[PDB]
């Protein structure tokens, strides 16, 4: 995606502050060129993209779509990389199209784009070229979810971009269903340790593996683990097989990351169902299981590098000892000989870190003190007691040690003689409320956690994965979600065509072969190609009834669990199913912040927002207007003064506070005071009275 990603903007290129939508504009051509759908998103769509699918591109920056360059009801089985143009001259045949098994599309008449891409009908008998498949100006990412033909493009591309924002938790799973894209796509991960020779296996262990390159020949091909992303994730790279077995170049060797059974592990083929419930799947609301926990299903870990240099300067430089001023014990009783502790070590927030230290200064104190120190012999030193300490939402175990010295030759920026950088684990065990989802864009926050029991549940006991409000899709579109999921339980559950005597007609056709589903097993379909409703439906009719050859499921979609609480029956049958989804690089700690106070523009001393800082949210002006719509004055005013940067009351009432008392009533716009001055300044003098 990042790869293939494509636009036309920036250095020397456009400056979106100058471009008519047309820039973003649609147009014919476009097909076999780039995902129609996806794009940027903010003021950004119609600005960037990639390729469609196949058609290479000119030795000169122009696509190369080959085509079903037809010939006399007998397309010329032949690529023809094409620069749209030319071509443009030519005849737009149609993929999805019934030939007389010969090129001989069995109709006399057909449609086809024309001069203006005039998608025009016509008599089959006439084109030069058909196509190269269905589905092509598509994107991969595009290429990912069926039911399209039922579903919001908006919603779509939405999910599209979405798509990415999965988060390789841990388990590894694939939607039992899903097209072929998939690992055959995923393979284009070109990542998994994957065969290099028809060699027999050789010694194996999670670092690499010796590889009987059957030419005698071998090579303990490697394998990576525990090494951060741009986003804090392992180097994991899970194997496949057995140091002794035998296989052949290019074939797999070992997954690792987004790499379910050789394949982007990407979600959880997951039951759940249909109700909007007690207002909890309402307004985006979302109602969520719990067993999950326990189940664990939902976590990985994440990686900061952890750095802190040793510097050089005026009053001295930036030491990294382990000694410290009136530091607690243990607090030190922990780090290494001369600072920070030792790899894989647990913590929390605050947690001191470095073994740093630096000269302090030289500018006297009150005898009072010293005296005081003389009073308590705490003969103060004089060095800028300095180091590092863990902020918030932070813990795990020691990792990085990029402690790299200037002094030790480790080249580094000025006035520094070394620096380390470190890491720590933390398994994110999924908060509810948050958000996940899967296909049909069909995003989904993560509202409430909810114990198992307390849960609608198989008449055969087994309860949900969660449940699902209704409503959107209607004003949304994506019901495949429905279908697909029907499907879901289906597959998940398998069946067999009892065609027996004869043919399920709608059957009478199609990947026959299936005839059945060994209750639950691998299942793909084409994009703009896949069975149908009725069929599908009728598939509903079909079945692999369970243990008790049972199917609580209805040849209908709606069964009737009861309440894992109050328990009784329900009003009416129960729509339900399953859905793999994915998880999110976007939640609280991604954005979990406020700010009580901290740094403040040494100029406009406003909340020096920052890492250590919470930023301290900025405020808007409308807003103010809101006030107005009331007039809390003060309030605002206050602000302006207070948390704004009221040096005083900040200090002052800050005290007050401190002294908790009928607060230093709001003062005066001070500074404002300046003004004046500022004015005068130019012979400006005046005044109110």
């Amino acid at each position: 995606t990042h790869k293939r990603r494509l636009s036309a903007l920036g250095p020397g290129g456009l400056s979106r502050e100058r471009a008519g939508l047309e820039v973003r504009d649609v147009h014919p051509s476009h097909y076999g060129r780039m995902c129609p759908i996806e794009t940027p998103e903010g003021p950004n769509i119609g600005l960037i993209g990639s390729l469609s699918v196949y058609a290479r591109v000119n030795p000169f920056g122009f696509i190369e779509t080959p085509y079903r360059k037809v010939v006399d009801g007998v397309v010329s089985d032949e690529i023809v990389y094409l620069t749209a143009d030319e071509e443009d001259r030519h005849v737009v045949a149609q993929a999805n199209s019934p030939i007389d098994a010969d090129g001989r599309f069995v109709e006399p008449r057909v449609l086809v784009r024309r001069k203006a891409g005039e998608v025009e009908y016509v008599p089959s008998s006439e084109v030069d070229y058909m196509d190269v498949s269905p589905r092509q100006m598509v994107s991969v990412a595009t290429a990912m979810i069926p039911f399209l033909e039922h579903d919001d493009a908006n919603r779509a591309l939405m999910g599209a971009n979405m798509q990415r924002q999965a988060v390789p938790l841990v388990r590894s799973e694939a939607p039992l269903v899903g097209t072929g894209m998939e690992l055959r796509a995923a393979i284009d991960a070109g990542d998994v340790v994957v065969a290099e020779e028809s060699g027999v296996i050789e010694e194996v262990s999670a670092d690499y593996i010796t590889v009987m390159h059957d030419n005698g020949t071998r090579r303990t091909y490697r394998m990576r683990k525990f090494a951060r992303s741009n986003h804090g994730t392992c180097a994991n790279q899970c194997p496949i097989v057995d140091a002794g077995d035998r296989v052949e170049a290019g074939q797999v060797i070992a997954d690792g990351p987004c790499t379910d059974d050789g394949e982007m592990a990407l979600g959880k083929n997951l039951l759940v169902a249909i109700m909007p419930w007690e207002g909890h799947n309402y307004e985006d609301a979302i109602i969520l299981s719990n067993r999950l926990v326990e189940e664990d299903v939902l976590t990985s870990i994440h990686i900061e590098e952890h750095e802190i240099d040793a510097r050089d300067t005026k009053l001295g430089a930036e030491e990294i000892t382990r000694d410290i001023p009136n530091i607690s014990d243990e607090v030190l009783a922990d780090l290494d000989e001369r600072g920070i502790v030792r790899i894989g070590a647990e913590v929390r927030d605050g947690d001191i870190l470095v073994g740093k230290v630096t000269p302090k200064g030289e500018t006297e104190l009150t005898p009072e003190e010293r005296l005081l120190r003389a009073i308590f012999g705490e003969k103060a030193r004089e060095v800028r007691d300095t180091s590092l300490k863990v902020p918030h939402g932070e813990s795990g175990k020691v990792i990085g040690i990029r402690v790299f010295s200037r002094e030790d030759e480790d080249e580094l920026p000025a006035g520094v003689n070394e620096l380390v950088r470190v890491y720590v684990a933390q398994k994110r065990k999924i908060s509810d409320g948050d958000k996940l989802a899967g296909r049909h864009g069909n995003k989904g926050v993560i509202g409430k956690i909810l114990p198992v029991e307390d849960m609608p549940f198989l008449a055969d006991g087994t309860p949900v994965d969660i449940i699902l409000n209704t409503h959107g899709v209607p004003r949304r579109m994506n019901i495949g979600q429905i279908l697909e999921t029907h499907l879901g339980w289906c597959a998940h559950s398998g069946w067999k065509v009892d065609a027996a005597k004869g043919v399920p007609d709608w059957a009478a056709r199609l990947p026959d072969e299936l005839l059945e589903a060994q209750p639950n097993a691998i299942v793909s379909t084409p994009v703009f190609d896949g069975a149908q409703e009725a069929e599908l439906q009728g598939l509903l009719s079909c079945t692999l009834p369970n243990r008790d050859g049972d199917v609580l499921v209805d040849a209908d979609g709606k069964a009737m669990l009861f309440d894992g609480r109050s328990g009784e029956p329900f009003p009416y049958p129960v729509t339900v199913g399953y859905m793999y989804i994915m998880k999110l690089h976007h939640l609280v700690d991604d954005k979990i912040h406020a700010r009580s106070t901290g740094p403040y523009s040494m100029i406009t001393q406003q909340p020096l927002g920052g890492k250590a800082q919470f930023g301290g949210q900025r405020f808007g002006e409308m807003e103010c207007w809101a006030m107005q719509a009331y007039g809390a004055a003060y309030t605002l005013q206050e602000l302006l003064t207070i948390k704004s940067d009221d040096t005083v009351g900040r200090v002052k009432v800050y005290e007050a506070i401190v002294k908790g008392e009928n607060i230093p009533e709001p003062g005066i716009p001070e500074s404002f005071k300046v003004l004046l001055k500022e004015l005068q300044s130019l012979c400006l003098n005046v005044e109110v009275l």
Binding site: Y54, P66, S133, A195, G250, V252, L514, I522, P526
Partner: peptide
């Protein structure tokens, strides 16, 4: 097809593409 470690996510090919998957990436 043409997949060494291949399983089968049985699909719904109503059709055929003599063509097959490019390599992208190439680029």
């Amino acid at each position: 097809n043409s997949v060494p470690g291949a399983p089968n996510r049985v699909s719904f090919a109503k059709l055929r593409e003599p063509l097959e998957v490019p390599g992208l990436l190439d680029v």
